[PDB]
Design a protein around this ligand. Structure first.
Ligand SMILES: Nc1ncnc2c1ncn2[C@@H]1O[C@H](COP(=O)(O)OP(=O)(O)O)[C@@H](O)[C@H]1O
Ligand SMILES: [Mg+2]
Length: 194
């Protein structure tokens, strides 16, 4: 229960799940990503959202590119974050096409400020929240920046996360600032806060 025990457990779990994700075959990535998103589009909060906030997936993370395409097809407004590393804040900005993105390093894609419009949190109906590991309780370990933990303080709309079932864990050592998500969709079903 010492502070280091907590931080070391988070790094340990983050490391272990990332390693597992990276080991996923191409077949598993493709099939599981397909299943998870098919289940997303059946959700009431998808159908009803007129503006959706989402991240651009990397490596073997559940594939969000098809989700953005579907949202565009359905006439939904799509917003993606630009992170400010100094303030640890996110500016969700609308994208109508993938040419409004730039690579802000190696594999990390963000909306080009000059070509995109910031959208206020109170205008975003659903936030699809990225992450590394989760519990049945909606608890969440991300990548270590604490961006969503900070953002979710002021965001009052609906939240959900997409996850492979192996990203589900029994216990996460949550700190007072860790924010939970309302729903998790895996290839096996959904975990909901009631
Ligand atoms: N609401 C907040 N206000 C201030 N600092 C925060 C807040 N939320 C998270 N942090 C900080 O962000 C850092 C990373 O958060 P952490 O929970 O460890 O990562 P993650 O949520 O990405 O898995 C921690 O050092 C923590 O102090
Ligand atoms: Mg956290």
């Amino acid at each position: 229960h010492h502070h280091h025990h907590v931080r070391e457990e988070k790094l340990r779990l983050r490391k272990q799940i990332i390693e597992h994700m990276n080991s996923l075959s191409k077949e598993r990535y493709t099939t599981l990503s397909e299943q998870i998103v098919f289940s997303l589009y059946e959700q009431k909060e998808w159908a009803e959202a007129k503006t959706i906030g989402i991240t651009l997936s990397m490596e073997n993370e559940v594939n969000t590119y098809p989700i953005i395409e579907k949202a565009w097809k359905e006439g939904k407004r799509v917003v993606v974050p630009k992170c400010n590393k100094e303030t640890r804040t996110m500016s969700f900005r609308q994208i109508s096409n993938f040419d409004q993105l730039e690579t802000v390093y190696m594999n990390l894609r963000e909306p080009i400020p000059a070509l995109t419009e910031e959208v206020n949190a109170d205008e975003i109906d659903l936030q699809i929240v990225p992450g590394v590991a989760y519990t049945e309780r909606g608890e969440r370990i991300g990548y270590g920046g604490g961006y969503y933990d900070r953002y979710l303080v002021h965001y009052k709309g609906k939240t959900l996360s997409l996850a492979y079932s192996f990203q589900m864990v029994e216990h996460i050592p949550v700190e007072p600032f860790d924010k939970n998500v309302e729903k998790i969709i895996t290839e096996k079903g959904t975990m909901v806060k009631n």
